[PDB]
């Protein structure tokens, strides 16, 4: 009876990932999940953040979004991670959050949860696919059940066709309707699969 | 009520993969699945084969193992791929079989199937991880549901702790007990997840 | 005062890789290298080739292009591999070629050659990056010196920004200038690096 | 001048430190001017405080200078070493990587040689994928990647990782076969770097 527990954990410096993660959170709500939308703790020093108005502005924009904790992943049945690409991997901020999950991992409390990932870069082929890859490889250490979107909808094709997960080319400009649709399909599908797995076991 | 349909598709030149895939097949039957154990079509030139008598012999050893076909994956609810490494990737033989799945893929007919992988190498760090990775990335294009073992049983730790999939150091000696138990756990786990998936979807 | 020996080894079904490889070959010549443009042997059955006009046409268009053999890599001081993506890996045809390199590898005669790679897919984010990655990982087994382009020109940006290697979105219509400039720089740069390494060796 | 070699390594409990010292000594033996550099510790002290070996190693490394972006600008050859965290590099290593954005955008990381090393508690527990993530990173800089491959018998004897040295961390001292693989990797990288620089002079 109880709704799928979905945790969307994103890092964003300049707002693309925050926009993407809200789209993911709404998709999950629309599809019947109980959602936690959670920001990855910022590690940068203020004097660095201060050099970028858009970074400082997004931090302000997300101020009422709670910070991700391990408890949130223990709670979750379905997990989505979203990070911007940093040299073809996830941000250090995201990896620092992951590096706090060792206790939960040691307890077996990350196993069997569904996992998918999203990303953004300033270049269309700028290491996005590898950023997604590295997040999935991590989830495998947890015994997670990975639910990438594939090409299971016409929307994937329409938005540049990334079967590994939603990836958005960041150019300051708001999200395109095709990217939004790619995110929606990814999340709805994951929620649907998670509901099925949970029903089969209970 | 109907058993999980498990297809175990493997390439083997000299017998390592054949032994691994037999162990997988036993594990699946023991876990209540209906199992197809299936060999990848040998695509190598007979002059190349004729310089390795163990390869010729293993071909004959597997004479009553049917050749894998797209039909088998269309049938399958749970899929296991097994290939030895060639320079950190799968064998060309395995990729040739993958490359015949285009029609099923176009028809949305590989989606929502479970998937894990296994591999071997003559070196312990010589592509026992990268080979599995490349097979998982391929399954993501299908919209498969990836069910790697992670560290979800003690036997994974005992056999070298490969969370991505069973991996065996190929030396001509019989399969170690710890490797066998890691294969069995992986396949059992995947059968059980598949069954829950199917149960909750009707 | 030997020109650098550059082998461009490419697989192409429908002509995109052939256009890319020709651009690579011209850039190599312009950089003062001695160039071989070499096609990967086609393994597809004729009745599969017979299903697609652009595939049949491309095979005929490439008729006078020599077929790649291991001795081409023994000859080369600088190697480029190009393959279209198949589910985020290289084609079986390219892997089949790679699998013929075991004797050369055993002899130690692949070591120390420079290596970079190129790819294509129908979708912008449809597995190109992973295809390149799998190709670089293979080259590492050889002790190749990997020379990917990174962002060392501002025409990487203009091409879509692929630091791992040129990657084109296959549309049937011809190659864009940005893609062509990306390829040219990648090859010119690799030839320059290779010439320095050889001069340094004597 | 001698090849400028920077060994940048993260270590919590000393395995990476031992690997990096072996690497630094190999670089010197090969005639390079060597910087042995630690990645800044970012873990909260209360986490470090839970583990004696982690506290002890931080003290053991106290006189190793912290890596900065300018060390990579200086360097002609770079080696990165991180233990695995779920098949990727440590957040500490990534945090250092993330400070290289300025050098990257000015193109001041191009044409340097790069290889990587790693460790895990499990032999197949990310000893290949961690290396691969670090190599992908270096591609973004236009680095020239010089992994060991199977270019010496010692590679086979240490488990046959062609991507880079990888050690199974059991808390015991470094095995000799592992030391030898690290030495070969670094010696080979220095040699290639020297040829590249000589040829471009």
From Swiss-Prot, chains A, B, C:
Its cofactor is FMN. It comes from Deinococcus radiodurans (strain ATCC 13939 / DSM 20539 / JCM 16871 / CCUG 27074 / LMG 4051 / NBRC 15346 / NCIMB 9279 / VKM B-1422 / R1). FMN binds at residues 12-17, 85-87, 120-126, 141. Disulfide bonds: none annotated. PANTHER family: FLAVODOXIN-RELATED PROTEIN WRBA-RELATED, FLAVOPROTEIN-LIKE PROTEIN YCP4-RELATED. Belongs to the WrbA family. Homotetramer. One of its GO terms (cellular component) is membrane. InterPro entries: Flavodoxin/NO_synth, Flavoprotein-like_sf, Flavoprotein_WrbA-like. This is NAD(P)H dehydrogenase (quinone). It catalyses: a quinone + NADH + H(+) = a quinol + NAD(+); a quinone + NADPH + H(+) = a quinol + NADP(+). Pfam families: Flavodoxin_1. Binds 1 FMN per monomer. GO terms for molecular function: FMN binding; NAD(P)H dehydrogenase (quinone) activity; NADH:ubiquinone reductase (non-electrogenic) activity; NADPH dehydrogenase (quinone) activity. Its EC number is 1.6.5.2. Keywords: Flavoprotein, FMN, NAD, NADP, Nucleotide-binding, Oxidoreductase. It is an enzyme of class 1 (oxidoreductase). The keyword rRNA-binding does not apply. Residues 6-198 form the Flavodoxin-like domain.
